[PDB]
Nucleic acid binder design. Structure first.
Ligand SMILES: [Mg+2]
Ligand SMILES: [Mg+2]
Ligand SMILES: [Mg+2]
Ligand SMILES: [Mg+2]
Ligand SMILES: [Mg+2]
Ligand SMILES: [Mg+2]
Ligand SMILES: [Mg+2]
Ligand SMILES: [Mg+2]
Ligand SMILES: [Mg+2]
Ligand SMILES: [Zn+2]
Lengths: 152, 146, 36, 129, 63
RNA sequence: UAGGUAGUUGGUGGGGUAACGGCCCACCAAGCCGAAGAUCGGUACGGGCCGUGAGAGCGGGAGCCCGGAGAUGGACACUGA
RNA sequence: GGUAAUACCGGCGGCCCGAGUGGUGGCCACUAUUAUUGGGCCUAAAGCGGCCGUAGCCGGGCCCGUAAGUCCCUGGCGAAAUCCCACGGCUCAACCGUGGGGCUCGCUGGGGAUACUGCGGGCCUUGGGACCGGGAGAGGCCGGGGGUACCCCCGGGGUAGGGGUGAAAUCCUAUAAUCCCGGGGGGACCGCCAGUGGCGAAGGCGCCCGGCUGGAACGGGUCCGACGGUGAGGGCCGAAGGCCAGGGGAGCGAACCGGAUUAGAUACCCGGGUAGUCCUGGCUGUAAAGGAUGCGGGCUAGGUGUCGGGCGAGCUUCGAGCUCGCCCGGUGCCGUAGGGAAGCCGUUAAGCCCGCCGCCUGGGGAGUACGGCCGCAAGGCUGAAACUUAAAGGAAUUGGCG
């Protein structure tokens, strides 16, 4: 079920099993790497780069090609960005959650009796800490980092 | 309710602790480990005892009954307590006199308490002046010291 | 007060809302009258 | 959440065959699941089975024959010495050779009747009869 | 036979639409999440509405 | 019955012992146990074994053998392997 | 057992064990009344009022290593007595001797194998999370505009009652009431539409317009890559009532003052009325806080309403419209297998499985006494024993009765 509520919900995306790219594609690997890098410099989130490739350029998910420099891995957007040095400086899951808990914290400063909104804040911060524990454990975040709300 | 709480492989400590915790909601175990029977018991863990009778009395029986049961007041020797004891048999009370020494057993009821329609009494007389009472009631032997 | 719903059953007793109110008055008298 | 993909399979099998079904789908498919199906087959409890890939861990199709009374998982996974089998066979099964007791010995998965012939032990994972 | 519950399969397609005031040929998605506009001229091709887009050009295939 | 310890934990140099050791002493530090129950109370000689039960277990450890300790209560020395 | 005793006390018959046979106290079995094997928690004892999370227990698929857990073989140990067997000596036997095994279930030196657990690398996407799109909703907090009803006051008209009850009376009225009309002010609440309808973790939320804000469902060849479940000790939220300070006060009204009914009437009924109920700032932390049903995952016939999204057809006064069929998520009913002591539950389980935490152990004494920690007080939380009793409880039958 959901993490905090307990509704089930099932909506999502259902993919076909497939190994090789489809026959009617024509974009070669380098023509797709340049497309991936061109869009990031328009200010696009790594989730909203794939939406546009799929909608407009007609490329089903980019995880159909292998990594050019490595036969083990498969291609993923974040593994293209770090090839050119454009990848984010903090996992953007964490960044979206943290940015969404900063203008709720200045709304709660003019309406301090809005007691039903300040529970969503506690729930957001629970999620932020759940993610920081994991990131610190996997070495993606330096150990001298803490979520201190009074900054930003 | 779910399945049952610590059914894991490395959960021995919590399972033992849950058992030791709920064993105290008992009454036969708490009463045997804290030793509550002694410290409140006029006879002190004995099967029998001896006393010296103070006065002879009669009790009324329970509700769906009628009649008077004869008994005595015994003053123990090892403690100094005063208990109430029952004289079993047809005409026994005519053999008990004051300033006599009597021997005392339990009366054998549920949980060690009392039995039948005599509800508050929990001891019975077996020997008078070192001469069994059962004999005296049915002839067969004579009572010393008057 | 940690009460038990078996006693609100009224068969062979008096009402419990009114036994509570009477226990409270004694827990007071034992307190003021030198409960110190 | 999900904690045991083998228990789910065995309860699914014994729930389905009790109402008369002739096919089941064991959705999350380990290779321990496949290894236990292999020995449920050789003793004549199920029919034939195949592994279908679906891009995410694969599925198992198995046809039932209506030849089992009960199947389940021995969960805490106790260990057994090679001379202490009857103590457990008297706890799970209904007569002195009624059915099999599946053991995870150091040479694969097998029934206790073939562990006693080599004289080895291991962890008990399940039982069928 | 082969229930949907095992091996799920989508319900949405890739099209081979063809522009109007540009003649250009493209591939698009049927349930888009953005506003699909042409890759030379800029006129829209599909529109986002809830479930399935409402296309605005000529279709050649369903791919 | 929630905090306990100040020769208490450790180091350097010594005395004493049949012998190693804060076992004692002179200096330098601030360590040491603890909610996985320390500290403080309660009861108790420990085991091989013994009673009971279909077994899992629950209860007892006077008498026989093996270890420990005591000689009305508390302190202290002589002779000797 | 009450003057007709197979139940007390004697006689005579009979029954069970027998050199013994009865009485009182203790431990085990009885007892699945301590439950690992192997119990309970809707109505009988028992789910924390609700939710968040630290330790701990439980944890998705594949590939390559290691060999700690685990399994097999082998050296050194776990005194004798005691325990089981066969044979031999006292007449057999109890007892004693020669041999085989068990027991002290626990230690340690090595060699072997990797299925599962643990530990170290790599690779995934189903669980969980992030994001975009078109919609639904009394979810919450500020600002502003209204709606009728009720009470009070001032003017105009009229003239003797009004009010209340089972029946009356206290009360209001000649300083002109009740009733009708023209105006001035004042607090609280938002009717019909309204729906086993919607939203929220629970307590709860219903006039309309504008602003900021939280969560969920559907559509999705988007992104991350096991980031998860439960949660002792700690933390926030919590109707009504009560408390401490400032404001306000129309209707209703614990305390209180009078009229009646009555054997009494400290009550029900009638005429008044203080605190309270409302607003700003805090404390208290309780309910039949109830679905008397803790939370996550998998599976096991159908039928039929209804709210939200999507899809496919057919109409159309082309409307954000109407009808039919299907997929996903909420909310109701009749019901198979199965479960239950029944009442009854039945894919929204009280069914068959895998987890984690909280509580229960005959009825009273007693939620009491004594101690501790919180609160300004009222009070909350923790919580025994001496003694006493043979039943107390539950779900359904036949009658008798209102
Ligand atoms: Mg002693
Ligand atoms: Mg029970
Ligand atoms: Mg109850
Ligand atoms: Mg695994
Ligand atoms: Mg021995
Ligand atoms: Mg002979
Ligand atoms: Mg012999
Ligand atoms: Mg012998
Ligand atoms: Mg708690
Ligand atoms: Zn164009």
């Amino acid at each position: 079920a959901r993490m905090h509520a307990r509704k089930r919900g099932k909506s999502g995306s259902k993919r076909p099993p497939r190994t090789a790219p489809p026959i009617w594609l024509e974009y070669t690997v380098e023509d797709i790497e340049n497309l991936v890098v061109k869009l990031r410099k328009e200010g696009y989130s790594t989730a909203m780069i794939g939406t546009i490739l799929r909608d407009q350029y007609g490329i089903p998910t980019v995880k159909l090609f292998r990594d050019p420099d490595n036969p083990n891995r498969k291609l993923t957007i974040t593994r293209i960005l770090e090839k050119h040095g454009l990848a984010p400086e903090i996992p953007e899951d964490l960044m979206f959650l943290i940015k969404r808990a900063v203008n709720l914290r200045k709304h709660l400063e003019q309406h301090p009796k809005d007691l039903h909104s300040m529970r969503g804040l506690q729930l957001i911060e629970s999620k932020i800490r759940r993610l920081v524990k994991y990131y610190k454990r996997k070495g993606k975040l330096p150990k001298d980092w803490r979520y201190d709300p009074e900054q930003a | 309710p779910g399945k049952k709480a610590p059914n894991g492989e490395f959960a021995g400590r919590k399972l033992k602790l849950k058992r030791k915790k709920f064993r105290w909601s008992d009454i036969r175990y708490k009463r045997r480990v804290l030793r509550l029977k002694e410290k409140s018991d006029p006879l002190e863990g004995a099967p029998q005892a001896r006393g010296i009778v103070l006065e002879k009395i009669a009790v009324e029986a329970k509700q769906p009954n009628s009649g008077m049961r004869k008994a005595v007041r015994v003053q123990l020797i090892k403690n100094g307590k005063v208990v109430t004891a029952f004289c079993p048999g047809d005409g026994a009370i005519k053999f008990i006199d004051e300033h006599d020494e009597v021997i005392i057993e339990g009366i054998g009821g549920p949980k060690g308490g009392s039995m039948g329609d005599i509800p508050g009494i929990r001891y019975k007389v077996v020997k008078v002046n070192r001469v069994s009472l059962k004999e005296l009631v049915k002839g067969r032997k004579e009572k010393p010291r008057r | 007060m940690k009460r038990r719903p078996r006693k609100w059953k009224k068969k062979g007793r008096m009402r419990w809302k009114w036994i509570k109110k009477r226990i409270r008055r004694l827990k007071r008298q034992r307190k003021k009258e030198r409960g110190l | 959440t999900l904690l045991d993909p083998l228990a789910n399979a065995l309860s699914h099998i014994t729930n389905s065959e009790r109402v008369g079904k002739r096919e089941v789908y064991i959705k999350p498919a380990s290779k321990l699941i496949g290894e236990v199906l292999r020995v449920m087959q050789k003793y004549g409890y199920i029919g034939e089975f195949e592994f279908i890939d679906d891009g995410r861990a694969g599925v198992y199709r198995v046809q039932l024959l209506g030849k089992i009374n009960k199947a389940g998982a021995i969960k805490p996974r106790f260990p057994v010495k090679a001379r202490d089998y009857e103590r457990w066979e008297k706890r799970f099964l209904p007569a002195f050779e009624f059915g099999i007791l599946i053991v995870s010995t150091s040479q694969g998965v097998m029934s206790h009747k073939e562990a006693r012939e080599k004289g080895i032990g291991g962890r008990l994972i399940a039982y069928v009869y | 036979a082969l229930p949907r519950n095992v091996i799920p399969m989508p319900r949405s397609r890739f099209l081979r639409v063809k522009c109007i005031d540009c003649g250009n040929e493209q591939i698009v998605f049927s349930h888009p999440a953005t506003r699909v506009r042409c890759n030379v001229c800029g006129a829209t091709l599909v529109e986002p509405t809830g479930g399935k887009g409402i296309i605005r050009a000529k279709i050649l295939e369903v791919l």
